[PDB]
Structures are given as structure tokens and as C-alpha cells.
Assembly symmetry: D2
């Protein structure tokens, strides 16, 4: 049995010149996860500050950009830190009031501004391919923490009886094929033609290709992503009438999940280009997102190409 704490240190030791700064940051994030886990499991019987405070009170990160807050947060006294964190403290917030799965998403980048000075939006506007690490914590029937630093997707399950995250899989990967699609069809009307065509494709009868597919949409990016990673599948959030540029935030949701998806052998695009290669323009920039099994994402890209929108 190996704990997340032991695992992080073991990976650090593969880098003889590591100083322990990244290890300290990942360790602080897992502590934040335990705190959130505790509060969630006792609703009726915050998250944003919990992670910020937990991280700030530890002089471990130069700054943080939180999905809610319109502006970054510069940690005083941590100007000498080299990493910045972008986070979605509570993904699928809505589900909290109904006892359904929710999650936390995090993305880590090495700052571009000089260490010793205050971070700027420039440190938070780097393309996804610059991520040092990314991960999520899914709080459901049980809790799991999943992350990557570029050498695979490490999955851990929280053991309440011990109060620690235990290694589940050192290199989690999407299964060979997927047969589940996750999308909110309530916004069907203005879905791009390609997405409507893809959904049709998903509903056709064809045993040879595991069709018709089954649909699942929890309402939490993290939870749906997690299920698709474990059993195979695809998550889709295209442009809609309410969100012409897509709903998900490129920097707080798309980039982190795309990094994880790729490291698990999957794919993540906006329907036409690789999510991780998009050069961000603003902190709250939104983007269409299709992520999951490679063959499924490729199908979506095919239909979008073949059935353009006027």
C-alpha cells in the first residue's frame, strides 16, 4: 500500500535537483482536498478560501487564479515562489445542494515573470501545453484524487479509516474504446450542426461499433470526466445559445482536463484544434470542449468538419 504523500516524494526523488517546492505545493493541495472532503460529507450536519488560505498560509505559491474571482490573487510574502495555480475549488457547485458528485480542479504552471516580484496575468495566460501539473478531486459516493505531471495519470482513493489517499493506479488510461457520451441536450437548439450530427451517430443501431451509445450527464465536469476516464466515453460542451463561445473556462477547466485526458491516452479539442495549444487571450476566456476517448473526439471533429455552421 502506497500513500499519495509517499508517492509525491518518490517522484520528486527522480529529480536530483528538485528543491521540494513542487512537492510542498502538491502536498498542500491534497490537504486542501481533505478539508473540502470533510465539509462536503457534512452538509446540513468556503471551499474557495479553504484552498486559498491553506495554500497562502503555507508560503507555497506565487499566486492563484480562482474560477469565480474575476482577478488573480497575489500571495504576499510568496513573491519568491515560482509556481502559480489556477483552480476551480468547487466544480459542479449546483450539485452540492442535491447530494450529487462535485469536484475540485487544479492546474500548475511555472511563472514567466521574475521570481521575487509580484505575479501578473501574464503568468496565468500561458497555453495549456506549459502546465507543470494538473489534477482533480472527485467527491462522490467515495473520494478520489487524480493528477499528472507529464508522466501518466496517477489515481488515488481516499481511505476514511486511515485519513490518507492510497495509490489505486500509477498510470490510469482510457479503455480501448468508449460507448458513453455526456452532454446537456437541453441546449440542443443552437448546437453546432456537427454536434447534432454526432449525437445522431451515437444513437444509430450498430452492434459492431457498440452503438447506440448510452448517455450520462451528472452536471459536474469532474464527475463526468472521471466516469469516462474509468469506463471510456466522451464529454461535450459546445457553443450554445447561452454561451456562443462555449461555457467552460479555457484556463480553469479545459486546460487541466485536457492535460489529464492526453496523459491517459485520450484527446481534448475545441472541435477544430488541440486545447493545449490554444494561446489564451483573457483570464475568463471560454471555449468549446470535447474530451475523452480518442476515437470519439475524432468523430466529433469529423462531423464538425463535414457539417460546418453557417
Amino acid at each position: 500500500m502506497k500513500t499519495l504523500g509517499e508517492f509525491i516524494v518518490e517522484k520528486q526523488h527522480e529529480f536530483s535537483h528538485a528543491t521540494g517546492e513542487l512537492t510542498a505545493l502538491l502536498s498542500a493541495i491534497k490537504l486542501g482536498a481533505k478539508i473540502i472532503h470533510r465539509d462536503i460529507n457534512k452538509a446540513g450536519l468556503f471551499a474557495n478560501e479553504k484552498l486559498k488560505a491553506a495554500l497562502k498560509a503555507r508560503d507555497i505559491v506565487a499566486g492563484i487564479a480562482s474560477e469565480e474571482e474575476d482577478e488573480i490573487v497575489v500571495f504576499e510574502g510568496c513573491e519568491h515562489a515560482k509556481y502559480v495555480v489556477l483552480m476551480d475549488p468547487l466544480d459542479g457547485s449546483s450539485n452540492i445542494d442535491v447530494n450529487v458528485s462535485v469536484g475540485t480542479i487544479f492546474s500548475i504552471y511555472r511563472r514567466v515573470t521574475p521570481v521575487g516580484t509580484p505575479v501578473t496575468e501574464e503568468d496565468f495566460l500561458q497555453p495549456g501545453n506549459k502546465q507543470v501539473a494538473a489534477g482533480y478531486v472527485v467527491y462522490g459516493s467515495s473520494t478520489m484524487l487524480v493528477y499528472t505531471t507529464g508522466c501518466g495519470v496517477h489515481a488515488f482513493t481516499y481511505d476514511p479509516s486511515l485519513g490518507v489517499f492510497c495509490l489505486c493506479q500509477e498510470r490510469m488510461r482510457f479503455p480501448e474504446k468508449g460507448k458513453t457520451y455526456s452532454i446537456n441536450e437541453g441546449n440542443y437548439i443552437k448546437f453546432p450542426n456537427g454536434v447534432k450530427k454526432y449525437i445522431k451517430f451515437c444513437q444509430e443501431e450498430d452492434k459492431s461499433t457498440n452503438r447506440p451509445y448510452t448517455s450520462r450527464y451528472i452536471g459536474s465536469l469532474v464527475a463526468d470526466f472521471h466516469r469516462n476516464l474509468l469506463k471510456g466515453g466522451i464529454y461535450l460542451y459546445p457553443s450554445t445559445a447561452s454561451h456562443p463561445d462555449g461555457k467552460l473556462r479555457l484556463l480553469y477547466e479545459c486546460n487541466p482536463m485536457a492535460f489529464l485526458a492526453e496523459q491517459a491516452g485520450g484527446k481534448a479539442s475545441d472541435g477544430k484544434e488541440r486545447i493545449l495549444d490554444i494561446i489564451p487571450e483573457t483570464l475568463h476566456q471560454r471555449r468549446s470542449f470535447f474530451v475523452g476517448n480518442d476515437h470519439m473526439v475524432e468523430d466529433v471533429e469529423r462531423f464538425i468538419r463535414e457539417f460546418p455552421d453557417a
Copy 2:
């Protein structure tokens, strides 16, 4: 603060003739919920056997009919008992492997055969309107037990720090209106024409009626039902290519949930008639199911009328 154990006893004393037999049954079911909660929260660091072995451990039921892995099992209990139980120990079982919400469903009936004799199938084939009690346990981000005996939908939240279920609401009810629909569109192709038309209706742009609706489908009857009860909405599982007569079992899923829905001010039908009044023919009978806010279920019934199937 009031515990479920205390609540059950208080209710018993509202009946001068009560002997405590039903109380012992409701109490055993609550304990079973705790056992399942434990096993589930320990994914890796079933409910069916534990429940049966428990419900027999005290000879508190005349017999039990259960749905286990698409298989229906009947168990013989104490011939001197007057209540019979139908259950779904694990609803949405496949969700267990992905740390997603799952639940338990139970339904109680007073036997029709004379006490002191062995129970027959007739004791389990009564129409839903004869239920003495119905309820579910939802194991998600947190756990809740919801049940009814005819005087409202009582909702309780589990307090892990004390190991007790705490009263949340004595009479839970659907909000005035709903704006969420839950269905597996993967089986779209052979949905009845009315259901396809209803989905279209749900997607039209019309603010005055909260449209387009939002879509959510966790994959667990209990979890989706639970969410729609708390926030309003409708769950649908019509006839499909794979299940010509619907997928849900009339006895272990439809009747119990219908009892709860009506008690909460909602409606439950198979598309044309009231679920609770259907006279069952077999222990494995399946049925189309539409349940949730009344105006939503009425819409489905209407569209099915305006657009019949050949």
C-alpha cells in the same frame, strides 16, 4: 435535532393500535442503510445479501422480493409476520465502480394471505396503491434517507460523526415548477413519438416558461429522482429498442417512487395511466415511467396523446 430512530417511534404512537412490528421493520431498513453506506464509502480504499441476511436476522418480515443484478429473488421469512418487502438493494449498481451516486429502494406491503401461513406471490403482486411505506437511500457526496408511510415525504440527512440520520424535512414537496428533464437519449431511435416531441418542447427557447430546460441524467434512478424532488424536474424511461415495455421494474422501482412522488405533490405514470393503480401480473414486470413535477408529466402524457405510435 431529531433522529430517525426517534421520529419512527413518535410516528408509531400516533396509532393507538400499533404493536411496533412496522417500527421494527423501518428500523431494520435504516440499519441496513448504514451498513450499505459503510461498504460503499469503502470503494477500494453486497448490499443485497447484507440486507437479506439482516432482515432475516430478526424474523421481521413474512417475505422479501428483490432485484439483484437484473435478477429477481424471493426470500421466505417469518410466517407470523404480516408485512412483506420488495426492494432494490443497489440501484444504479454500475455507478459504484466510478464513485458516482447510487441508491437503495424499498417498498412495504401488508400481506394479503393469512398470518401464520407461508407467503405466496399474491402477497407481492398488489397494486402500488396498497403500499404501507416506500422510500430510498441515496449514497452520494453525502447520504440521505427519504421515505413515506402516507403522511408526507420525510427526508433525513446522515450525520457520520454521530452515526445517526437527522430529520431534515417532515413533508418534502416538489417546488411549484420544474425545469430539468432526465432521460437516456442514447436510446432515442425507438422512443415513442410523444417522448421525442416532448424533448423538442423541452429544448424550445421560451423564457416565460423556463425553457429551454436543463438536462441531467446521473444514471441512478434514486439520484436523479432525489435531485428532481429537491429542485423540481422530471425523470423519464419510456419504451426503447432494448426494452419494448420500459426498463424499470414496476414492483421494485416504479411503485415505490410513484408513492413518494405523489406524496410530494408530484405525478407518476407509464405515459397513459397512474402507476400506483396498475394491477401487476408478474414479479418481473417492467413499465414505462414518467415521474416528477405534475405539469411536466402532464405534458408528456399530452404529447403522447397528440402523437400516438403505430
Copy 3:
């Protein structure tokens, strides 16, 4: 597996004319125990009010006399209740600050004043032989609840994973012989001559009678009593320079523990007479106490008789 909750009800059913009032009281006490357990297991990370409030808020007892409080507590609106409770919410209080075992003691009596009127000190000054029930909860490495109603000593172990007390032994009894004595020798100087002589006896070398005995003194009546009940032994608190009449309170500590000791096949006396037959004179009356294995208590009585004090 049987829970304390199930057990209490099963015993109630042996009395066809029981109304459930005693069951409700015992049930409320166990809930109070869970509450105390929770707070104790998180020191740094009350008890009196917890039990009073928990019991009062349930209109379950006519009144309560707490070891601390100099006067009884009449529960308003519960004048119609027939039972009164004497308690030691936190026994061995001192040990709480040092992470050592502590406990809760309770004693139940049927009131003597008419139901419907306020209880008086007379209802709390009855001799121990009138107890309807008595028990304790020991909070240590793990927690256990132990009680009796006159038909043996029922022992339960708290299962944190389930949040319930599980039956350990339906009739716990002292082992055939004991070889542990528990006393605070710091107060040796004014110990009665018989007690000094008994201690000498305990220290003699004589394998045939398991001597010399081993000594153990946790500082918590409940914890020491509990260990002696499980492994055999005797607890002693005689008159001392600081407490000429003994330290323990006759009504809140001696009577409850004597009832339990006798029901477990042991003995409890003040050195000359049966504790349960002493007719109390005041609410905070103190008394010498020797309790545990019968042969050991008899030895103490023998030495006290044979070596009187001037």
C-alpha cells in the same frame, strides 16, 4: 450482529404491558453517549448539558440529579414522566486533559412522588436496591456501553464505522477469581487499619492464591471498574484524611456501580454493609466503596472487621 437499539426493544417486548417510556429513556441515554464520545475524541481538535439537554429536549424523564450540581433539575413539561435519573456525566474528569480513559455513569429510579407533579429530593434519595437500571459508558482506546435492569450485565462496543453500539456480551460476569487491586495509595496515611492490612495481604508471595496481586489505578472509577469486570479485580476508595467519609458519592457513583457489580456476580460494600441497602440521607452523601470480585471484597471486609480503627 445485534445493536443496542435492537436489544433495548427486544427486552421491552418481554414486558407486554411496557409503554416504551423506559426504552425511550435508555435510547436517549445512548444518544447522549454518542455525543459525548464525539466531543471527547476531538479534544483540541458541556457533557453535563449535553445529557441534560438531550434528555430534557425529549420529554423523557421527570428530573435529573447531576454529580456536579448541588441540586436536582426538574424538567418542565415532563412532570408526567415516572423516571428520574442520577448521573455522573464525566467520571474521571481530570483524565480528559491527558488523553486518558474517562466515563459516564447513570442510575435510573421510578419516582416515589405522584406522576404529574414536580419531583423532589425524595425521588432521588431512594436506596440503591430500588434502581430500575444503571450503567456506564467508558471512553478509552475504544468505547463501550455497559448496563443492567436487573437481569444481568449487557455489554456493547461502539462501532465507529457504523455509528452504533453492537452487542458484545448479553451477560457479562466477573471471572472466577481476581488478581488486581485498584486504590490511590497516595492517601495511605489515614487509610483504615483493615485496608492497610489488606494491601499487605495483596503484596504477599503466594502462587497458590495468585499473589502478589498487580495494581492498576487509572484515576477513573468507570475505567478501573471496567477493567476489573473484564479481567477480575477490586476497586477501593476508603475513608482518607481528605475524605473521612470516603470520596465517592453514594448516589451518583456507588449505587450504580454496585448494582452492576452484583449483576455481574460480584460484590459492593462500604466495608461493613451492602451498598445497595444503605438508606441515603443527603444528595451528596459520600461513602467508602469496595467493589469487584466477591472473594476480594470479602477479604477487605474481613480485615476491616478483624483490625478495627480506634
Copy 4:
């Protein structure tokens, strides 16, 4: 709030030459504490094997010497490790069966044999003054981990709701004076004359010096030591009829506790000389032990001088 995991890392960085090897050892011991805490809190609803299997699971120690059920076992670890560990996985083991306080003791030494070779007994026979670290875990009403590496006695409380040890005090110290003595008077007969005289001293009536003292003896070295450190006091285990050279093992109990006692401003001797300076002769060596407030241990040494044994 600071966790033990964070505290250990902070301490490591106070040493420019640190490589993280000792940190990995202290971290493994802390995890082992959590494992034992779990098993213990689950009495019925061992520490030795779990600890060894764990401390080997990562090849983090050159070797381990342990006391298990009065038996001494030696285990061979990674030849490339430079630290050796001596432990008492379960101290006061018999207390487990009675839900009483128990503990774990550990002692760490830098090996004397060259790294890269197999460890010898010489690596485990060093005098206490060569310890790199010492500490204990007390599992009682609640759990605490206390340790030292030479810069104070660091005390931590376990938070079950988060599964982490939280810093309570960086430099725990005995209060100015003590007024509690802990010893098993059951073995009185052959106590040395000085110890008998000291006990007399403890029982004299003299307010000016807080006498008579109070007596407490839980039966667990760790628990009694823990209490005396927090409230002041002295623990004594001299030579007895059953153990002519004392009962406590010099290596697994005396040295570790002596290290902690001195670091807290206390004293630890065998009655005549400093425990930490004794040169061990065997792995099973036992020794008389007097530890706690300095003035108390000095009194014992004095009485032993004024009243020698033939």
C-alpha cells in the same frame, strides 16, 4: 494549523546537508501510527507486523530491533540505509483487551557499521546518548504523537476528521513541580529500601510541598509517562521479586523515554546513574527506571543513597 507532515519537512530544511532519508523514516513511523490507531479503535466492533511490513515496504531502514510479546525480534532492512530503529510497537498490550490506554515507542540511531554492508548487533547496542530521535504515540480517549530529535519535545494531536496530526506544542516541558507518582505497588515486598522510603515520603502530610502526592498507574509506560509530562509526576519501575534487574527493556523503553524526559527538562535514571549514558551489553537488557520531574527523581536517588540494599 500545522500538520506533522509539514512540520517534519520544515525541520529537515533547517539542515543544509539533509537528504530526506530521516524525513522518510519519521514519515513512515507517523503512517504506522495511523494504522495502529485504526486497528486499536476497532477493538471488536498486530501493530508489530504492520509496522515491520510497512517499514520494509520502502526499504527505509538498515534494520529494526523490536519487543513483541516479551520477545525481541531483529529484522534486516536495506544495507544502503544509515538509520536503525528500535521499537515497542505495542506498549501495555494487555490494556488493549480492556479498552484502556496503550502506546507505541520508537527510537532511532545512525548506524555505526559502514553503509552498504549488513547491520550488526553493534548498531543496536549504542548508548541512549547517541539517539537521533525518540518518540511515542499514545492511543487513549484520543490520540497524540510526541517525539524529539534533540531540539525539544514536539507534541501533536490526531484529528480523525482529517486524518492528520496537528502541532500542539513545539517544546513540551514538565511543569516546575510534580505531585503524582506512578508505580505498581503490587511488587512492594522486594522493592529496594530507598523506593519504599520514597513512597513513605510521598504519603506524608505536608502542604508546603504538595504532599501527600496523588497516585496513578495506568499500566502503560506511554500513558503514565504522557500524563506525568503534561501534569508533572514521576514513573517508577525498580527491581522487584519477579524482575531483579527491573522489568523495562533498556533499549526499547528506557532510552527513548529518557531522551524525551531530558528534552522536556526532566530526569531519567536507574536509581543511581543516567540512563542515556549506560553502555548496553545485550539486546534484551532490562534496567530499573525512574523518570519524570527532576526534583522527584532526585528524591528517589537520595533515598536510595540514604537507605542502601544489602
